[PDB]
Every structure is written in structure tokens, then in C-alpha cells.
PDB file of N, CA, C and O in Angstrom:
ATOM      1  N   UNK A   1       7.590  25.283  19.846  1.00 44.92           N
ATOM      2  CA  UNK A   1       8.615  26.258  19.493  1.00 44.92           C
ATOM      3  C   UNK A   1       9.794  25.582  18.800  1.00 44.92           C
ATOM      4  O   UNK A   1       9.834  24.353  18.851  1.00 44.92           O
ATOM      5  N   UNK A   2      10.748  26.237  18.165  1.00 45.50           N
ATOM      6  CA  UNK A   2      11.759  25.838  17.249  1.00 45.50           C
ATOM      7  C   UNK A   2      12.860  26.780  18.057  1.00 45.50           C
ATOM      8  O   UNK A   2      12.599  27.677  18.857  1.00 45.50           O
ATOM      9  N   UNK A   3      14.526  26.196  17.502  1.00 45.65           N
ATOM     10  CA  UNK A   3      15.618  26.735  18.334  1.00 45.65           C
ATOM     11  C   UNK A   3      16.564  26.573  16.626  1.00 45.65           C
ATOM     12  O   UNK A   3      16.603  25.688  15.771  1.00 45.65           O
ATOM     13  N   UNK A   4      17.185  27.878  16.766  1.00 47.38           N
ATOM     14  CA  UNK A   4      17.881  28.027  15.523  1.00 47.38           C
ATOM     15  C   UNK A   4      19.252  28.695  15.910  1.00 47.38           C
ATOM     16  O   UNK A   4      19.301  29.778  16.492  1.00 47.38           O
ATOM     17  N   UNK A   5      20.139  28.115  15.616  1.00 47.89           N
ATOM     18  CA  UNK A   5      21.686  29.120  15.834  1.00 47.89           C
ATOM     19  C   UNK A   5      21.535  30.490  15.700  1.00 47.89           C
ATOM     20  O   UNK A   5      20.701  31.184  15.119  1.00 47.89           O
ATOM     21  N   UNK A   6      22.597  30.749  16.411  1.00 51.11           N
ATOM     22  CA  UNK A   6      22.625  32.406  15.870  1.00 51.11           C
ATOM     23  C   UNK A   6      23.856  33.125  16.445  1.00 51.11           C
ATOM     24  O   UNK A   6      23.857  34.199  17.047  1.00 51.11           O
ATOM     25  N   UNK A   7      25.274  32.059  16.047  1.00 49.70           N
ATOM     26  CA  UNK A   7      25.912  32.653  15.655  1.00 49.70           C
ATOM     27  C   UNK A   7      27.596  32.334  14.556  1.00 49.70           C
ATOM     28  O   UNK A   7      27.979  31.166  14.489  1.00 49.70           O
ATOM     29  N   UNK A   8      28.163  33.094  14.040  1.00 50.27           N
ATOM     30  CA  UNK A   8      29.009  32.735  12.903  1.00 50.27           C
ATOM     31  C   UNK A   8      29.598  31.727  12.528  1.00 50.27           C
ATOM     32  O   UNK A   8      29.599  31.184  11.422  1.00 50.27           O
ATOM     33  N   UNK A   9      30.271  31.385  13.759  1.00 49.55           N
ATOM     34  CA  UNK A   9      30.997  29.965  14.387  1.00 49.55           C
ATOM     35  C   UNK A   9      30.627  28.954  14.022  1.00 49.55           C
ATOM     36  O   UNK A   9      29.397  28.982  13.983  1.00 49.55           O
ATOM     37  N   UNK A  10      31.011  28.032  13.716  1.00 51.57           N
ATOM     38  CA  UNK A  10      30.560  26.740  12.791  1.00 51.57           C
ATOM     39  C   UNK A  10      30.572  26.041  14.160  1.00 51.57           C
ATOM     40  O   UNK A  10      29.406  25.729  14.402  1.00 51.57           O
ATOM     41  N   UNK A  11      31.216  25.739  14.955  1.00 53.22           N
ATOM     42  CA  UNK A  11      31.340  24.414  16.270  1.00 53.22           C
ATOM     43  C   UNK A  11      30.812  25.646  17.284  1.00 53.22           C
ATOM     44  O   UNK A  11      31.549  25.643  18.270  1.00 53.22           O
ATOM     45  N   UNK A  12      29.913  26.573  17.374  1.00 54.05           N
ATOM     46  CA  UNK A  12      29.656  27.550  18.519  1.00 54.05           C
ATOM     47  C   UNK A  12      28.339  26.990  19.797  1.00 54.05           C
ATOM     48  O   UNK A  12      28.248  25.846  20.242  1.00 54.05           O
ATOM     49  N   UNK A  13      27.634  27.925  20.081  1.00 54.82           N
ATOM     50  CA  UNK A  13      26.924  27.364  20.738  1.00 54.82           C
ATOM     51  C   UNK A  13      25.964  28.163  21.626  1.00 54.82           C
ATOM     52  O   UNK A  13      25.491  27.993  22.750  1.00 54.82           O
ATOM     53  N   UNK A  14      25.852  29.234  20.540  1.00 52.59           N
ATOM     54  CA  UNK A  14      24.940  30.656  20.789  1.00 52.59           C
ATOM     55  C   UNK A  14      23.887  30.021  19.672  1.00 52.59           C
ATOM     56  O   UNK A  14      24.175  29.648  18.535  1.00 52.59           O
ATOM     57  N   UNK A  15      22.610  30.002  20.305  1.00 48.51           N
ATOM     58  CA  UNK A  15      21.566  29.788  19.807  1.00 48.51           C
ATOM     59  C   UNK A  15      20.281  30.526  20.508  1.00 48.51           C
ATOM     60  O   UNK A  15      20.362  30.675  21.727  1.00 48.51           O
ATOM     61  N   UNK A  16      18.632  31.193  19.580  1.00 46.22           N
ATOM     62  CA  UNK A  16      17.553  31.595  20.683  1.00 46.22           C
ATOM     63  C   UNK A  16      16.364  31.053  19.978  1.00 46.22           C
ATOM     64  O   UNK A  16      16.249  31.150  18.756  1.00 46.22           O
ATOM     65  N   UNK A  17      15.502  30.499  20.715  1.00 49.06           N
ATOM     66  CA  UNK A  17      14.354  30.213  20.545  1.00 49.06           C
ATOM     67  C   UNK A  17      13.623  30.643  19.353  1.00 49.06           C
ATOM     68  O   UNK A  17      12.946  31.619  19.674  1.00 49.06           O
ATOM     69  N   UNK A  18      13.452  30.336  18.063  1.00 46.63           N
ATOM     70  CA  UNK A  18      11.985  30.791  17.237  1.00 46.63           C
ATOM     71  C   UNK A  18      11.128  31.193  17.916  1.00 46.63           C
ATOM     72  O   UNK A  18      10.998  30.683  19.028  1.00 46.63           O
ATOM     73  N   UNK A  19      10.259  32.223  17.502  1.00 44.41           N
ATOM     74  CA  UNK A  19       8.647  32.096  17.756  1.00 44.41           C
ATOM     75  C   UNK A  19       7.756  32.394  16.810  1.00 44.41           C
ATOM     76  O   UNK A  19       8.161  32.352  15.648  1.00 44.41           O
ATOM     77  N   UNK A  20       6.511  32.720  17.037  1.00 45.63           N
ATOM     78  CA  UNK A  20       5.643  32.802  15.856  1.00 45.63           C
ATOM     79  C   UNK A  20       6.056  33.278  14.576  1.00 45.63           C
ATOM     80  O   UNK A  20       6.960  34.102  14.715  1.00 45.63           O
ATOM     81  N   UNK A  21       5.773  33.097  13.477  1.00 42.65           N
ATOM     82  CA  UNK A  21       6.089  33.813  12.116  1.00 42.65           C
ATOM     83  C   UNK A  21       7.252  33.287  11.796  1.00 42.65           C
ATOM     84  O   UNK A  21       7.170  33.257  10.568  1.00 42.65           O
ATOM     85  N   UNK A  22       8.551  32.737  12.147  1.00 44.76           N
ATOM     86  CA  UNK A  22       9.183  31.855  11.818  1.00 44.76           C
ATOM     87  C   UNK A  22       9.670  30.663  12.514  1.00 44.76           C
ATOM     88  O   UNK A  22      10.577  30.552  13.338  1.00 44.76           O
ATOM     89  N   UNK A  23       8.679  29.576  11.883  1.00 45.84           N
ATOM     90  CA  UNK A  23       8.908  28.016  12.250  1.00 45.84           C
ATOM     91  C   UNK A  23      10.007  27.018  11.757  1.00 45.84           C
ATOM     92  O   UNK A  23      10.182  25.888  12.214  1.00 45.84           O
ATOM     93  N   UNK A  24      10.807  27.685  10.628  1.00 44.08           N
ATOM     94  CA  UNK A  24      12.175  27.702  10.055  1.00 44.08           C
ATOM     95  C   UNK A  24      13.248  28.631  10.174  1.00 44.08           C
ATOM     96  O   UNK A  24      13.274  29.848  10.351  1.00 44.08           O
ATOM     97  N   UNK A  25      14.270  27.619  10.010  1.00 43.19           N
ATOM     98  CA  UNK A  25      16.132  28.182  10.057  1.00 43.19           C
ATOM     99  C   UNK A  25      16.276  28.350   9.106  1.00 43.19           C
ATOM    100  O   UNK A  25      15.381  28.202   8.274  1.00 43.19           O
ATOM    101  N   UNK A  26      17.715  28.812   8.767  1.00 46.67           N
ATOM    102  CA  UNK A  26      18.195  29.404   7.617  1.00 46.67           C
ATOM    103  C   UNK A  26      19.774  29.392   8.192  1.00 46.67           C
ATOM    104  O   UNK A  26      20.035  29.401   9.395  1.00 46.67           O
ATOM    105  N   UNK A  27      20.868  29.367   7.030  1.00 51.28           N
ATOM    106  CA  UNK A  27      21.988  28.963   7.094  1.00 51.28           C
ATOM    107  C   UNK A  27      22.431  29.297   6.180  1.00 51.28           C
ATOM    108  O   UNK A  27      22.111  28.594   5.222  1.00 51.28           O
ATOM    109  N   UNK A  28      23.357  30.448   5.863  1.00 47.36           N
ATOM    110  CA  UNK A  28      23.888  30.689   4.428  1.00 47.36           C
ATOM    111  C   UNK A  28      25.581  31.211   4.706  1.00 47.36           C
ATOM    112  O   UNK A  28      25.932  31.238   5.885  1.00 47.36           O
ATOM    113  N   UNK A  29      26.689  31.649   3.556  1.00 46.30           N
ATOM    114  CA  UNK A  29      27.620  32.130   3.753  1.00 46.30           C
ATOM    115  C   UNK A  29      27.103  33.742   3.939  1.00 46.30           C
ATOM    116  O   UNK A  29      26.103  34.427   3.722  1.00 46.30           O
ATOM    117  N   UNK A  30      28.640  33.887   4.555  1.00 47.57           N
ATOM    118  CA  UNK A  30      29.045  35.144   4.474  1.00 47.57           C
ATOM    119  C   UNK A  30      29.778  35.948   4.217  1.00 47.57           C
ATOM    120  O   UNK A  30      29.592  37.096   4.621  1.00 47.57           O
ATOM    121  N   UNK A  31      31.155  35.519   3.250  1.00 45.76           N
ATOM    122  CA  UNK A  31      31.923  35.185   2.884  1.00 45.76           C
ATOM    123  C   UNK A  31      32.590  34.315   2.484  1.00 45.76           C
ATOM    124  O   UNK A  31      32.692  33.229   3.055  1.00 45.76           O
ATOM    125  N   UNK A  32      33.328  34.717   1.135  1.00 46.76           N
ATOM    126  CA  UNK A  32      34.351  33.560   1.275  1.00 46.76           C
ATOM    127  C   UNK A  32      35.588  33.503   1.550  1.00 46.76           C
ATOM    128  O   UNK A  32      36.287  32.842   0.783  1.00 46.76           O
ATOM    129  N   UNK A  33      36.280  34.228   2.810  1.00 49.27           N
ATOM    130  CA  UNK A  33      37.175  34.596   3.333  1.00 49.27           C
ATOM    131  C   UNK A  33      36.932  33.847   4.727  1.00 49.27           C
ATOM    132  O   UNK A  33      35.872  34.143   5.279  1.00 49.27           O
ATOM    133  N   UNK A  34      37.481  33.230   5.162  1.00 48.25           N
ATOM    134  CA  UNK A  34      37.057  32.917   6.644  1.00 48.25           C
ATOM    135  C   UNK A  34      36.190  32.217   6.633  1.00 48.25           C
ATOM    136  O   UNK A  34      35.901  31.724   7.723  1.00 48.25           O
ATOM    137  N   UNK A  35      35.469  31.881   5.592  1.00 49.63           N
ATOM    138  CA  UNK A  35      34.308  30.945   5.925  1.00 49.63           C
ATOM    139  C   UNK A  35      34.129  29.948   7.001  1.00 49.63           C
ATOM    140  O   UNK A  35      33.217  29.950   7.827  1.00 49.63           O
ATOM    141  N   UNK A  36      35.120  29.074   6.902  1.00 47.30           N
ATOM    142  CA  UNK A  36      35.281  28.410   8.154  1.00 47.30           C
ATOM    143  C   UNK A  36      34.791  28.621   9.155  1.00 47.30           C
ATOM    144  O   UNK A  36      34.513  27.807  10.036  1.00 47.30           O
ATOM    145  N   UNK A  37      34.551  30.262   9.132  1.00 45.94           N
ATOM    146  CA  UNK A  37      33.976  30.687  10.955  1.00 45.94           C
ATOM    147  C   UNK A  37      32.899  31.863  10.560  1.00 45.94           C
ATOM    148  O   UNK A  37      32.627  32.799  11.313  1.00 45.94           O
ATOM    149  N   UNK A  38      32.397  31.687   9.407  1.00 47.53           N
ATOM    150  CA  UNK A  38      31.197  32.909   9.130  1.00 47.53           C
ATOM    151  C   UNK A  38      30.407  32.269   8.220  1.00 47.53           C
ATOM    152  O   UNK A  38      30.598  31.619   7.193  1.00 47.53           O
ATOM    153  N   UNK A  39      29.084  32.767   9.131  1.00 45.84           N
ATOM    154  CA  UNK A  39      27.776  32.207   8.275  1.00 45.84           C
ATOM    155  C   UNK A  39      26.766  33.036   9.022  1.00 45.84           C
ATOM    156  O   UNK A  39      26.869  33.669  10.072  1.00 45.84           O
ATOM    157  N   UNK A  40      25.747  32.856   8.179  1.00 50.44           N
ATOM    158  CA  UNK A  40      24.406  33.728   8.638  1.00 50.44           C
ATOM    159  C   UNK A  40      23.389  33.244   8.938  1.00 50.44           C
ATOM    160  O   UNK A  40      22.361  33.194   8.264  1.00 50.44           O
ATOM    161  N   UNK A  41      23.756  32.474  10.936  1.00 49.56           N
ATOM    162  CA  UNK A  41      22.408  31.542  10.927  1.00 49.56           C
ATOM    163  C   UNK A  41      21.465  32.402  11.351  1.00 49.56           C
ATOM    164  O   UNK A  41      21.897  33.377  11.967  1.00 49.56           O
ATOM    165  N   UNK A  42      19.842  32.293  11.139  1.00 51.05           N
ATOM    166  CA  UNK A  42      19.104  32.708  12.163  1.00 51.05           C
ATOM    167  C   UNK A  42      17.848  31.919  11.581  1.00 51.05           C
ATOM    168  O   UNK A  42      17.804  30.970  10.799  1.00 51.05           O
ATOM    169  N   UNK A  43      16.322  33.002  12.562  1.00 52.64           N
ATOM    170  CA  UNK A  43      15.451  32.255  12.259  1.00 52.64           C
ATOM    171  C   UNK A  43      15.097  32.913  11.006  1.00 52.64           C
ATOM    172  O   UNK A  43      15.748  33.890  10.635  1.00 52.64           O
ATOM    173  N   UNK A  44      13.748  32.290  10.063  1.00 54.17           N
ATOM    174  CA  UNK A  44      13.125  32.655   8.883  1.00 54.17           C
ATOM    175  C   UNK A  44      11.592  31.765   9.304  1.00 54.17           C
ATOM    176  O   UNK A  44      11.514  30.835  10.107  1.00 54.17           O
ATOM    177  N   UNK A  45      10.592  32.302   8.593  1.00 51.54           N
ATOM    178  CA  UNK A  45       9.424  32.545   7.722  1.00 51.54           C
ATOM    179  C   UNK A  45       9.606  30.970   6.941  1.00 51.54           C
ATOM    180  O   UNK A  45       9.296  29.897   7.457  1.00 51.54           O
ATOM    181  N   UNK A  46      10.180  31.163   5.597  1.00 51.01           N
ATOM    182  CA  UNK A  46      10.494  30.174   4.818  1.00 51.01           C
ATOM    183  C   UNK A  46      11.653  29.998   3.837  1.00 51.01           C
ATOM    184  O   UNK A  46      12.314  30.994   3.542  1.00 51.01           O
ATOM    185  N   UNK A  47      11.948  28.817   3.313  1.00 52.38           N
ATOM    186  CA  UNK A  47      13.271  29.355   2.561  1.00 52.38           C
ATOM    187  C   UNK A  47      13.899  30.343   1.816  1.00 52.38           C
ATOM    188  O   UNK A  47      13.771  30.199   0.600  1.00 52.38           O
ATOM    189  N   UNK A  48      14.606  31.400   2.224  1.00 50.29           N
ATOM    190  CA  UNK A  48      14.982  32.294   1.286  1.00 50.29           C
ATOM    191  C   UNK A  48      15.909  32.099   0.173  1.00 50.29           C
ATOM    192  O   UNK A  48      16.954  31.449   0.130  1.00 50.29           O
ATOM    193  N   UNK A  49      15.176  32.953  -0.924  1.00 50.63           N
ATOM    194  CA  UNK A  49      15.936  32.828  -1.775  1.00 50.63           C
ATOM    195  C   UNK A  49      17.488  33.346  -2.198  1.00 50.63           C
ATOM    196  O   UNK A  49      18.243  33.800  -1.338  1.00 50.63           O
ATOM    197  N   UNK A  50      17.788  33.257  -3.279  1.00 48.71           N
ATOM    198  CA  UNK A  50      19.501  33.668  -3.331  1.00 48.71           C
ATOM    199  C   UNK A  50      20.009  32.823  -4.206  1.00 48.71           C
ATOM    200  O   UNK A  50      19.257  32.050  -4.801  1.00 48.71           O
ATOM    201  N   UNK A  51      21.500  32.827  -4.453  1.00 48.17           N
ATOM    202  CA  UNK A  51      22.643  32.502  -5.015  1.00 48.17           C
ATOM    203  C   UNK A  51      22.665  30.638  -4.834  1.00 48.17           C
ATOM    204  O   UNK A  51      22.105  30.006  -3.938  1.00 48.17           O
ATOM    205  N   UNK A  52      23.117  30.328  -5.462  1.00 45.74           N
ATOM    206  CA  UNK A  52      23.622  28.922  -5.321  1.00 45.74           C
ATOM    207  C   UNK A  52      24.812  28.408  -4.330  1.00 45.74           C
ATOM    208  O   UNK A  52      24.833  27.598  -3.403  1.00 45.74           O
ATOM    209  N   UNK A  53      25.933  29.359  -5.029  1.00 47.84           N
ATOM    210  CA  UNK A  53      27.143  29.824  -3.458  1.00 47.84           C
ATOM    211  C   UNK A  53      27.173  30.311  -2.837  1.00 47.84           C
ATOM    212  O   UNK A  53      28.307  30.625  -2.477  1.00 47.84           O
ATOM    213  N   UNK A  54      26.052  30.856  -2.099  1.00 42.93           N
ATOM    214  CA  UNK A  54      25.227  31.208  -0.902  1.00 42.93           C
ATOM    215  C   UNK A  54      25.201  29.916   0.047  1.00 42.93           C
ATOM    216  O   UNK A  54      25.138  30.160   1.252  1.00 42.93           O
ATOM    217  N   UNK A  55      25.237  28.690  -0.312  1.00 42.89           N
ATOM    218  CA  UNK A  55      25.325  28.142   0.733  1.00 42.89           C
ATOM    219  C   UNK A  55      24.069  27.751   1.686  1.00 42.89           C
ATOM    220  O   UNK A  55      23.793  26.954   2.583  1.00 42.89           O
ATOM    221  N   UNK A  56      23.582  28.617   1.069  1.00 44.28           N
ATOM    222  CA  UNK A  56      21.907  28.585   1.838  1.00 44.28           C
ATOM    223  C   UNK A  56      21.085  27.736   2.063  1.00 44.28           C
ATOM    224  O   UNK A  56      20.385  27.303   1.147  1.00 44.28           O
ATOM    225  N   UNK A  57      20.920  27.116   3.836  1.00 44.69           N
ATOM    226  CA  UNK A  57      20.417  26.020   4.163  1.00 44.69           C
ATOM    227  C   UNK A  57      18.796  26.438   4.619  1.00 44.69           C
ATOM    228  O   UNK A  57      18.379  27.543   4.965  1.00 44.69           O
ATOM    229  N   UNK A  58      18.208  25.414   4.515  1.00 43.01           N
ATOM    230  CA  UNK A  58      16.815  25.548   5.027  1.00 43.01           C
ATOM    231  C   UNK A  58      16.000  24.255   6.054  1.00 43.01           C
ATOM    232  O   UNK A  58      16.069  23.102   5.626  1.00 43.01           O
ATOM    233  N   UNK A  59      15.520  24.420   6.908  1.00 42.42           N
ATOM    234  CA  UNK A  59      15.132  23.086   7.727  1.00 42.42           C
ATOM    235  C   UNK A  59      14.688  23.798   8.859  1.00 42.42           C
ATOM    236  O   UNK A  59      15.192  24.842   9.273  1.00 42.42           O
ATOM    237  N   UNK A  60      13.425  23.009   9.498  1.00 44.86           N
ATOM    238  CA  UNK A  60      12.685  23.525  10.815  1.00 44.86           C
ATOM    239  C   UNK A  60      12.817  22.733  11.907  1.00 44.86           C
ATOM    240  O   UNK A  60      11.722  22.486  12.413  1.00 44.86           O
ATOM    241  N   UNK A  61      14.201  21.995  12.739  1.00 47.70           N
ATOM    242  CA  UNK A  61      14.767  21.328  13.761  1.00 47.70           C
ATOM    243  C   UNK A  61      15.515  22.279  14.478  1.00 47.70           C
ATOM    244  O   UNK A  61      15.887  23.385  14.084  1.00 47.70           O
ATOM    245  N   UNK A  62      15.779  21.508  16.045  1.00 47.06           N
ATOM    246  CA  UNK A  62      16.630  21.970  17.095  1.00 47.06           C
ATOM    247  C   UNK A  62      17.844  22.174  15.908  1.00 47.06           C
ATOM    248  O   UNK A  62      18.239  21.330  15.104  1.00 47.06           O
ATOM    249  N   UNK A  63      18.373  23.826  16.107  1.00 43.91           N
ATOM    250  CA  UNK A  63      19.784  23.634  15.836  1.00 43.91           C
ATOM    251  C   UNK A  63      19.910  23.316  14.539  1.00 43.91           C
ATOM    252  O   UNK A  63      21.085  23.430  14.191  1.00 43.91           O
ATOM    253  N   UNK A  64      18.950  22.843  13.375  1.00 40.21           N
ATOM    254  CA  UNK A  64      18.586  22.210  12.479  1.00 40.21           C
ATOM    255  C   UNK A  64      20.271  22.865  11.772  1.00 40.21           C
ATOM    256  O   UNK A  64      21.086  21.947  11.680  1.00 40.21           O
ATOM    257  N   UNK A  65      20.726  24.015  11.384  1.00 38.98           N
ATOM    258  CA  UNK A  65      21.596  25.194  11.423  1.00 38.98           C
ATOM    259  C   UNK A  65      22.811  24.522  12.370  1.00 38.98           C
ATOM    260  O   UNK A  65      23.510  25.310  13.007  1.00 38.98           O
ATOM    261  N   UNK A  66      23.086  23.025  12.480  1.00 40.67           N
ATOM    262  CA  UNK A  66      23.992  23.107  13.346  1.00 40.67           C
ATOM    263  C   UNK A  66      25.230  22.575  12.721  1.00 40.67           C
ATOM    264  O   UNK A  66      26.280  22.541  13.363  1.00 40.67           O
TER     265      UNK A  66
END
């Protein structure tokens, strides 16, 4: 199994387990207001696509999203 953040907070520490169908994280903005404290971790499938200033991270580790 895989463990992916899941939530806005950059230093947080809300995270839930992957399971089947996505063995990868994902990490992107959500703004650029506040950024500092907003992002869109969760699990994924495979890298999604998007924007360049999206921010959008990809990797299949603990927290990999951390």
C-alpha cells in the first residue's frame, strides 16, 4: 500500500492510505493567494495532466506529497 497527504497545509499532518487503482500521489496548487497553505494533495492513478503553474507534483512514496 502507498500513503499520500491529504491535506492543504504545507507542514500538516492529515494523510490516508492509497489503495488499489491509485499507486501514485499528486500535489498541485490551488491558488495563488495563500499558497503557502493551499494545495491539492491526494491520491491518483498516474500523473495528471495540467498547467505548468499548477505546480503539479507526481511520485509513488510515504507522504511522497510531503
Amino acid at each position: 500500500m502507498l500513503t499520500c497527504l491529504n491535506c492543504p497545509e504545507m507542514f500538516c499532518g492529515k494523510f490516508q492510505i492509497c489503495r488499489n487503482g491509485e499507486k501514485i500521489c499528486f500535489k498541485k496548487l490551488h491558488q495563488r493567494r495563500a499558497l503557502s497553505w493551499r494545495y491539492i494533495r491526494g491520491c491518483a492513478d498516474t500523473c495528471p495532466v495540467g498547467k505548468p503553474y499548477e505546480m503539479i507534483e507526481c511520485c509513488s512514496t510515504d507522504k511522497c506529497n510531503r
